[PDB]
Structure formats: structure tokens, C-alpha cells
Amino acid sequence: FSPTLIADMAKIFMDNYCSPEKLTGMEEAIDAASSNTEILSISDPTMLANVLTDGVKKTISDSRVKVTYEPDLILAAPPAMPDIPLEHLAAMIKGTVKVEILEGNIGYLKIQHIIGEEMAQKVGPLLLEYIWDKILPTSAMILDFRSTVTGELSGIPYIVSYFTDPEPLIHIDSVYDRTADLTIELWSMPTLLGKRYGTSKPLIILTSKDTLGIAEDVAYCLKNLKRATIVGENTAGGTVKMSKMKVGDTDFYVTVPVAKSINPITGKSWEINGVAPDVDVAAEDALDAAIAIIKLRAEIPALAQAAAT
Ligand SMILES: CCCCCCCC/C=C\CCCCCCCC(=O)O
């Protein structure tokens, strides 16, 4: 063990935590913890991990930060792979989406995985006809994120851009990564492969309590941009990036949020609390409600013109 252990955990935490400005008093609690003889009296490594974990809680107020003792932890490395041609990547993407026109000429696109910039640029031309051209002529659009739990940050501009004006460029999100000490800015793209959907047609996004990750960010941003109505349940409240980090040559690990979104409109984030629906309904009922909203609103102009004269 040693007191060295505490010092080395602390450095990993301090060097990587996404919000260093909130760490007043931390260096001091580290010093105290290193000389706390009750801590020094712990021989059980799992008890040591639990104690340090609760100690940081009563110091930092962030429930995502944890120390664990994990002997026998092996992380599954990415699998070995031959060349995968673009046509087979396109077939894999087809398997993660459901594209449909629902009665009423309403576009439906269920997206299980938000694809990243590389994939979108390289395989997108192979999917234009299959996904996008099918739903382009619809009068309204429903994006179904109710079961979306994975995705890439770099895909966000590709979704938002199709639903917004080319000009002015929109600053969609700003993400800070503490480990890289870098801010990543996400902007709309004035030129796209496909045609824009326009700004007039209704866009509704369906959400569930399971909706997690980049999908929460897409919905949050389109909501704050006043482009989309959110229908369903409050989303899960994920984190842009967690890292689980080994402490030296020891079996202790520090788990820390290392990146965060700082929304250009709200100043806040989708993270932790998730995104609140505009129309709150059970997730199983979200699709029916979205359809009903779109249908009613489309009826309004004709109603008005009959009443006016
Ligand atoms: C993520 C690793 C950071 C290192 C942790 C430093 C934070 C301070 C740790 C513990 C505070 C001490 C509180 C518990 C005292 C033990 C007394 C008791 O359990 O009865």
C-alpha cells in the first residue's frame, strides 16, 4: 500500500476531472487524507476504495467519481479486422436504422447509433437513396431516439445540419476534454451531400429514460435551437466521456468524468440530469402522441381560413 497510493490516485483525479474550477479545498483534503490514521489502518483494499470514494463525495458532490479495487480486470481490446469495404459498412448502418413513411405522409427514422464524421462522410453517399431520399418528401419528421444508447460526438453536426438553414453557421456545442486540455467545437456545415429538410416542416424527437449519450445532446441542441419538439420521458443523463484509470502498477482504478458539454445557448448541459421532454408521456405512447400533435397542427391553417371567411 503506502501513503503514496493516495497521492497517486489524487493526481490522476486532479489531472483529469472535467471541472477543475470546482476543486477548491481538494489539494488540502488530499494532504489530510494522507495522514489520516484511520485510512492508514485499513488493510482491506475494497474497504480502502469505498472509504476514499465516500470521502471525495463529501468534498466534491459528484457521484460519478469512484475509486475501485479491481484485480483480474481485463479490458476487451478492439477486435482484429481485415479491410471492411464501404459497401459492407453501409449494410451495417442499414441494420441500425428503421426508415418509414407513416400514414399521414410523416417521416420516421429510428436511429440506434449516432454515426461519426468519418463514417458519415465515407459511407453517407451509399445511404442517401436508402434513408434520406425516402423521407425528404414527407410533411413532418419523427426521429426516434427511444432506444439510442451509443454514438459518436462528431456525428452531431451531420444530424443538426439537415434540419437547419445553411446560413448563418450554428455553433451546436462546445465540449471540453480535461485529459487533452482541449475544447472541441461542433458547428453546422453549410454544404451537405443530401438536400436539407428545411426549417418549416415539424420535427419531433422521441425520447425514453434509456436514451443515453450523444443522442441526448442532439435532442438537447435541437430543442434549445427551437427546431424540435421533444416527446417522451426525460432521458438517462449520461456524460460525454468517463475514463476508468489504473493507478500505477496497482489494482486500484480511478473513475472520473473527463469531458463535458458546455452548451452555447443555455450554458448548461444535457449531462447528469438528461433532457426534459416538451410533451411528457410514457415512452411506449410517445410515437402515438407525436403523430397526434403533427396531425392537429397541420389541420390548423385550414380551420383558420374557414373561420376568417
Ligand atoms: C479519487 C481519489 C482521491 C483521494 C481521496 C481524498 C479525499 C479524502 C478521503 C477521505 C476523507 C476521510 C473521511 C473518512 C475518514 C475515516 C473515518 C471513518 O471512516 O470512520
Tell the residue nearest (CA) to atom 18 of ligand 1.
Answer: 38
**Strands of the chain, DSSP E:** 66-69, 97-102, 106-111, 113-114, 140-144, 150-151, 171-177, 182-187, 203-207, 229-232, 241-246, 252-261, 279-280
Q: Let me know: does 48 contact 22? Beta carbons within 8 Å.
A: no
Please work out whether the CB of residue 294 comes within 6 Å of at least one atom of ligand 1: no
Q: DSSP H helical segments within 177-285, as ranges?
A: 214-224
Residue 47 CA to ligand 1 center (angstroms) comes to 11
Q: Let me know: does 258 contact 177? Beta carbons within 8 Å.
A: yes
Query: What backbone torsions phi and psi does residue 33 show, to the nearest 5 degrees?
Result: -55, -35
Q: Let me know: does 123 contact 155? Beta carbons within 8 Å.
A: no
Burial pattern 224-243, b for ≥16 Cβ within 10 A else e, equals bbebbbbbbbbbbbbbbbbb
What experiment produced this structure? X-ray
Kind of pairing between the strands at 279-280 and 171-177: unpaired
Which triple of cell numbers denotes residue 29?
483534503
Q: Let me know: does 40 contact 51? Beta carbons within 8 Å.
A: no
Cα→Cα distances 78→37, 75, 151, 258, Å: 43, 9, 16, 21
- What the chain holds in terms of domains, given with CATH numbers, is 1-69 (no CATH), 70-309 (3.90.226.10)
Residue 303 CA to ligand 1 center (angstroms) comes to 66
Q: How many CB atoms lie within 10 A of CB 77?
A: 6
Q: Is 28 helix (H, G, I), strand (E, B) or coil?
A: helix
Q: Let me know: does 242 contact 141? Beta carbons within 8 Å.
A: no
Tell the residue nearest (CA) to atom 6 of ligand 1.
Answer: 30
Please name the residues in contact with 113: beta carbons below 8 A apart, sequence gap of 6 or more: 96, 148, 150, 151
CA nearest neighbour of 120 among 75, 157, 82, 70: 157
Residue 168 and residue 161: Cα distance in Å, rounded?
A: 11
Residue 273 CA to ligand 1 center (angstroms) comes to 27
This PDB structure is determined at a resolution in Å of 1.9
Q: Is 260 helix (H, G, I), strand (E, B) or coil?
A: strand
Residue 52 CA to ligand 1 center (angstroms) comes to 4
Say what angle helices 26-35 and 4-16 make with each other, to 10 degrees: 170
Please name the residues in contact with 92: beta carbons below 8 A apart, sequence gap of 6 or more: none
Please work out whether the CB of residue 38 comes within 6 Å of at least one atom of ligand 1: yes
Stated length of the chain: 309
Query: What backbone torsions phi and psi does residue 252 show, to the nearest 5 degrees?
Result: -90, 145
Residue 8 CA to ligand 1 center (angstroms) comes to 14
Please work out whether the CB of residue 30 comes within 6 Å of at least one atom of ligand 1: yes
Could you say which DSSP state residue 278 is in?
S
Residue 206 and residue 193: Cα distance in Å, rounded?
A: 26
Q: How far does Cα 88 stand from its chain's mean position?
A: 26
Tell the residue nearest (CA) to atom 8 of ligand 1.
Answer: 55
Q: Let me know: does 38 contact 52? Beta carbons within 8 Å.
A: no
Q: Let me know: does 188 contact 169? Beta carbons within 8 Å.
A: yes
Q: Classify the phi-psi angles of 218: left when phi > 0, otherwise alpha if psi is within -120 to 50, otherwise beta.
A: alpha
Residue 9 CA to ligand 1 center (angstroms) comes to 12
Residue 251 and residue 280: Cα distance in Å, rounded?
A: 45
Q: What is the 3-state secondary structure (H, E, C) of 71-118?
A: CCCCCCCCCCCCCCCHHHHHHHHHCCEEEEEECCCEEEEEECEECCHH
Q: Is 227 helix (H, G, I), strand (E, B) or coil?
A: coil
Could you say which DSSP state residue 277 is in?
-
Q: Classify the phi-psi angles of 261: left when phi > 0, otherwise alpha if psi is within -120 to 50, otherwise beta.
A: beta
Please work out whether the CB of residue 40 comes within 6 Å of at least one atom of ligand 1: no
Q: Let me know: does 118 contact 133? Beta carbons within 8 Å.
A: no
Q: Is 173 helix (H, G, I), strand (E, B) or coil?
A: strand
